[PDB]
Amino acid sequence: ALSEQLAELEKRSGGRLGVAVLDTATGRRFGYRGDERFPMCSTFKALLAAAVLARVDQGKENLDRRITYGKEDLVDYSPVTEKHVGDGMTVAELCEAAITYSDNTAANLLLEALGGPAALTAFLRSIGDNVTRLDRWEPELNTAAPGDPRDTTTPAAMAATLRTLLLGDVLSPASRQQLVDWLIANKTGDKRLRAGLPADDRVGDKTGTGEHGTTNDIAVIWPPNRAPILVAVYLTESQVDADARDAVIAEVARLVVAAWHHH
């Protein structure tokens, strides 16, 4: 079954593969290494944007507030923020850049607006995630050293937290739709989960990439007129090249779609 298929795929990747599925139609779930820690890399940015939106809902933050910065603030891999040193960007624009491009400077600027990694972790604890932890800033949080619990989640905790944030009562309706809209507009995921999902599904996702052959993708999937399915995939310590790691994630999606009918 799916678990044996994922084990075969995992062996071919040379690394460690974690998968969680949470179907909101029924609450049906699946885990493969669902309670093992994996480096989040940029997947944390979905949670970061949620924490920012929570502050907006509380009147402590404004999506239209403009944040200025210089080249002195630019992290490697900042494809949006590097274009806006002159004029800065709004909190909303930074959230969009962090989610849809994995923009590292946007993420650091939002972390600063929140109070840093400890503040994000405290937000997660406050909504019932006792597992996920952010400890470092960009780019160090992508080090992905084996055995290091810093900056990690588990597939099951991430899927449960996504459910709470996108579909629960933590965020206002407008904030929930805004977070969904950003995920649906993601630009970094075309070779990962999306490449293995049916064309008529609407998909929002957030990728992560790091050292030690780390390639991740977390998604909210709406098949036609159906309640959504959450899928969280983490791959680390992989020994195949970048394109092959993407193909592992795409194949997880294909296997999940093909096996999800099983009760």
Author numbering: 28 to 58, 60 to 238, 240 to 252, 254 to 293
Excerpt from the publication:
Finally, catalysis of Kemp elimination is enhanced by an additional F290W amino replacement in the neighbourhood of position 229, which likely stabilizes the transition state through a face-to-edge interaction with the new tryptophan residue. Furthermore, the double W229/F290W variant of the GNCA4 scaffold is the most active Kemp eliminase reported in this work with a rate enhancement of about seven orders of magnitude over the rate of the uncatalysed reaction. Regarding the turnover numbers, the kcat values obtained for the W229D/F290W variants of the ancestral β-lactamase scaffolds are up to approximately seven orders of magnitude above the rate of the uncatalysed reaction. Unlike previous rationally designed Kemp eliminases, our best eliminase displays a maximum catalytic efficiency (∼5, 500 M−1 s−1) that exceeds the acetate in acetonitrile level. We therefore determined the Michaelis–Menten parameters for the degradation of a penicillin antibiotic (benzylpenicillin) and one third-generation antibiotic (cefotaxime) catalysed by GNCA4-W229D/F290W. We found levels of catalysis for antibiotic degradation similar to those previously reported for the GNCAMP β-lactamase. Our results show that the GNCA4-W229D/F290W β-lactamase does in fact also catalyse the hydrolysis of p-nitrophenyl acetate, a substrate commonly used to assess esterase activity. The catalytic efficiency for the hydrolysis of p-nitrophenyl acetate at the new active site, kcat/KM=11.7±1.1 M−1 s−1, is similar to the best values reported in the literature for rationally designed esterases. Furthermore, the turnover number at the new active site, kcat=7.6 × 10−3±2 × 10−4 s−1, indicates a three orders of magnitude enhancement over the rate of the non-enzymatic reaction (kuncat=2.5 × 10−6 s−1).
Here, we explore and test these notions using resurrected Precambrian β-lactamases11 as scaffolds for the engineering of completely new active sites. Of these systems, resurrected Precambrian β-lactamases have been thoroughly characterized in terms of their structure, function and stability. These putative ancestral proteins have been shown to be highly stable and able to efficiently degrade several antibiotics. A hydrophobic-to-ionizable amino acid replacement generates a buried (or partially buried) residue with the perturbed properties that are useful in catalysis and conformational flexibility assists the generation of a completely new active site by facilitating substrate and transition-state binding. We have shown that, when using resurrected Precambrian β-lactamases as scaffolds for protein engineering, a minimalist design approach based on this mechanism leads to levels of catalysis for the Kemp elimination reaction of up to approximately seven orders of magnitude above the rate of the uncatalysed reaction, as well as to significant ester hydrolysis activity.
